[PDB]
């Protein structure tokens, strides 16, 4: 690892940013990270980098005000018989997970964590109530595909009552991914490496695309 700083003579762009990455790798073992980038002049720019899109909380909150105009509400839970909750707690808790703060920590967001073992029938009752914009269902046990059955059932339920489209349905859990997600009826699925910011940035853009 190496700390390396310098300054290029290009207006402060994401291009110059790249130039920075270039000039970095171009000088030995890389995988550069341009930690800081600020301009000294409209024609000059300083750089700090280390070597060898996802909105952020501040941003997604702005995006919500300038694009949606009201606080959005999200209801999540570990549905069915699944008692695993650490996961949904990683995205929904104030404290969040590994540095990424949960959705309840966001200003333009009302996150309602209903916890573990929530019957789809109850989940839906609760989404209609707190008038949710985003539904979050987490699944962990894959035993006899009890999860695929359960997530599939929640979709039928929603649709049978003519409700699916009212929501951005997100699913995730250790054995989940976006491929599995889409072919089941959900708008997106999030695996073990994802965090609240990943969810937030996706939910907010989708909302916007829909509300148009």
């Amino acid at each position: 690892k190496v700390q390396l700083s310098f300054t290029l003579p290009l207006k402060n762009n994401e291009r110059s940013a790249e130039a920075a990455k270039q000039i970095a790798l171009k000088m030995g073992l890389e995988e550069p990270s341009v930690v800081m980038q600020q301009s000294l002049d409209e024609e000059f720019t300083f750089f700090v980098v280390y070597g060898n899109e996802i909105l952020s909380m501040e941003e997604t909150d702005e995006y919500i005000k300038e694009n949606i105009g009201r606080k959005i509400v999200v209801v999540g839970a570990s549905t069915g018989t699944d008692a695993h909750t650490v996961g949904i707690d990683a995205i929904m808790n104030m404290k969040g997970y590994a540095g990424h703060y949960g959705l309840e920590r966001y200003e333009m967001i009302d996150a309602y964590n209903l916890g573990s073992q929530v019957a789809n029938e109850d989940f839906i009752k609760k989404a209609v109530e707190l008038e949710a914009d985003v539904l979050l269902v987490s699944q962990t046990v894959t035993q006899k595909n009890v999860h695929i059955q359960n997530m599939t059932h929640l979709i039928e339920l929603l649709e049978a009552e003519g409700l699916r489209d009212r929501f951005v349905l997100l699913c995730g859990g250790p054995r989940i991914n976006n491929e599995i997600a889409k072919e089941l009826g959900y708008d997106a699925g999030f695996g073990p490496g994802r965090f609240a910011d990943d969810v937030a940035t996706f939910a907010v853009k989708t909302l916007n695309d829909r509300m148009n």
């Binding site: 800081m36 600020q38 590994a98």
Partner: protein, 516 residues
Amino acid sequence: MESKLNLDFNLVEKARAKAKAIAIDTQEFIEKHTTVTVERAVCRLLGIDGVDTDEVPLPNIVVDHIKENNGLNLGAAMYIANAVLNTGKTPQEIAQAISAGELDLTKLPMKDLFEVKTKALSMAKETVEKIKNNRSIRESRFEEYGDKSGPLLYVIVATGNIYEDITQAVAAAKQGADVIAVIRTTGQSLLDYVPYGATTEGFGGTYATQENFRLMREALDKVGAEVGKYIRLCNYCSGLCMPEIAAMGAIERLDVMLNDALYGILFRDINMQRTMIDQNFSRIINGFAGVIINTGEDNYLTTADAFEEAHTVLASQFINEQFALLAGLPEEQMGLGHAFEMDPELKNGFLYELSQAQMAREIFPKAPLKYMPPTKFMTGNIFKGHIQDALFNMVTIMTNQRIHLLGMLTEALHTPFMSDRALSIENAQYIFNNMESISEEIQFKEDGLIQKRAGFVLEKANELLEEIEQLGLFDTLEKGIFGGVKRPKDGGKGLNGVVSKDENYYNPFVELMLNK
């Protein structure tokens, strides 16, 4: 501490009285109950350890046993003792036997109460000794080595792999650190069991484990004698196993541990009742163990606007103070916390920070206060960051804070490198030495910004605690009046692990460790 702010100590005493009301009121509730986690702590204090086949900690199964047979209200201690009487096997063996399905504490004849209770108390008596001795072990090392009187440099290590944490901890130990904390795995406070054994892998940092504690302590002890200093070890109590983690560190003898009354409730959605019962007993153990706890007020400043949340922090500190007291923890053991988190572009900002830091110092004169570094505005500009870590270092020496959590120029970027740690320490030693007497030398103008800022924060914290006292703590949390967070009296995680005490309940450890 002299009064440099001309603070109104009547107001101070008035605020503190409200915190005491709020606390005692909630205490009435704590005493009338126990929790699944309290009992597992009790079991551990009596020697039950190890795991079963599916890697479930034996304390969880023995207590889970008693639980489903409607026994918890009496509390582990009795059954465990009863069992030992007519059975004569060690509680460790009582555990394995219960695991194997070879015993049933619910169906053994329940000998005379006064007989087991007495047995209970004789068992408790042993481990309390081990603990009491560890406290002496520490006193004994300080007198041999002496202890810094200025601020203590507190650094952090966290690879997720214990053996790796150690090579880093000992390096940091001689690089000059006085307190070393191993960052607990992200989210551990959500687990309802404590993993068993050494940990070789973990996200966001190393798991909290009794074995892990022992290794680290053994290490620090080695490099300690080396440098002729006693490195204080620190870990986190927060979560659904607070007491257990506290009993755990009491027997391996950590020196400081994070122990906040409202953390779990406000930031991890752990049920308020469960949380208020767990903190009470973890605090008792820590207190008796001679441990210095750390509160987490920084959590209130890392995201909210730090300038306008200063009274929340002061109120939080008062409230933690009062509970710690109800658990026998004295002021010289309460490492109350605060932080340098205001926006660096704020005019006179440094004057407001200094003021508040000075305020807390005068309000809690006997507490070894914990002052934490800036993090929310720390950016990729490593140069600017080093200087705002410097203005942070200045406040500590100007206001006599005692536990100094060193800021890192690389803060917003990654856990520190060998270099990041060194630079951070030289920055702190330069400022601490160059401005050594600055707090005696410096005074504040009559009714200027500094003094007026402090009194506004104090008047506001008093105002807040007046409402909190009007509603009682639970109602306060139910309506989000504190921390901008609303939480359900019967919501959150762990409520199902809370049980009311029945007339024959008995924790021999309370009278041995508290005793009023």
